[PDB]
């Protein structure tokens, strides 16, 4: 296998789970009880980009779906969105910089910096039922740290 890929789930500092709101919308909320299995799993591909011992360049796409997380500028502001990439031409090792995330691990928590937008990480508000957006204030009010849980394929 030229490009390896694993599947894992992401949770915020409040232990919230990422769920698909609309076809191209992601939300972060508390998921417990027997509703935990509604969790969305993301596939991490070993792409090409800025690599280090702490920061690893990986792609983020929905498991068994051609929906990938993309970082673009909308109205002079960097925003996150879901792009429907070619189902037969994706994924690939050399992915577009807007689809390349810099998964860093400073301590026990992991941070996802955008390769397209340096110092901009995936953020989510502390509040419940809040959507996912791109923030440039890591360690501020909005959650900028996440967890990684490997699932069964």
């Amino acid at each position, epitope marked *: 296998a030229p490009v*390896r890929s*694993l599947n894992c789930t992401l949770r915020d500092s409040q232990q919230k789970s990422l769920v698909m709101s609309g076809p191209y919308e992601l939300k972060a909320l508390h998921l417990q009880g027997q509703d935990m299995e509604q969790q969305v799993v993301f596939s991490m591909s070993f792409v090409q980009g800025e690599e280090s011992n702490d920061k690893i360049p990986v792609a983020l796409g929905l498991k068994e779906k051609n929906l990938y997380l993309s970082c673009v500028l909308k109205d002079d502001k960097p925003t996150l969105q879901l792009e429907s990439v070619d189902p037969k031409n994706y994924p690939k090792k050399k992915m577009e910089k807007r689809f390349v995330f810099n998964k860093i691990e400073i301590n026990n928590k992991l941070e996802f910096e955008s390769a397209q937008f340096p110092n901009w990480y995936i953020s989510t508000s502390q509040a419940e039922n809040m959507p996912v957006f791109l923030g440039g204030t890591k360690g501020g009010q909005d959650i900028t740290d996440f967890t990684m849980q*490997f699932v*069964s394929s």
Partner: single-chain antibody
Amino acid sequence: DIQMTQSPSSLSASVGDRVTITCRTSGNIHNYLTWYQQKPGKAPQLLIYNAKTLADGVPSRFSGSGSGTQFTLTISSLQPEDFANYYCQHFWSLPFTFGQGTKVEIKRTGGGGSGGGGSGGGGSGGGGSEVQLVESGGGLVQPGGSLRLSCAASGFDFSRYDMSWVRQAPGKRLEWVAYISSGGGSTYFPDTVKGRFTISRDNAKNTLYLQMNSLRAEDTAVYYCARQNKKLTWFDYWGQGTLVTVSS
């Protein structure tokens, strides 16, 4: 998931022979293979890690090779003390299980007192550093019940070293149970054991607490304390193991 396949299961060689153990994976991990040695009645030890990296303190007669989807262990010179079960492992993704196990038997004609001595050196258990993990809490419990396993950590950094939990049923391979972060957040739990177990750590008493709820008959096995040492998911030190049996 990613299964493992070893060859052979058992073999007989002479003292000084070049033993070769083949290990195959169901997924092209490329370079994420681990090799462990479990002595009869003792705790398993990490001989080879990262596919081709020897452990610090491991005899030079132990060499590891392989790349891609095929790995091989090579013993430059098989000694009578090398009698044990060799189980490989992958640290790339789930389920983090071991192979079938390869047993190496030393075929000796008969030299009278052919065996060896003990283990240890100057300072062992006395004037010197000694890393030890002692688990407790095991016993016989009724199905559906609960049990709290505790592992005592000593001889090393408790807040600098991370650890995990692995179980091995009598006459079976080793299966991952859970991960217990030194920080206290990232909770790695496979869908298989998800919800069944819960981990907790005490930095004051230097002990790990494993809460086992809604135990099933398939949970019957030995629980060994596993410890890491880097940023990768590998164990370099195993505890003695606590036997847990669920019956009526």
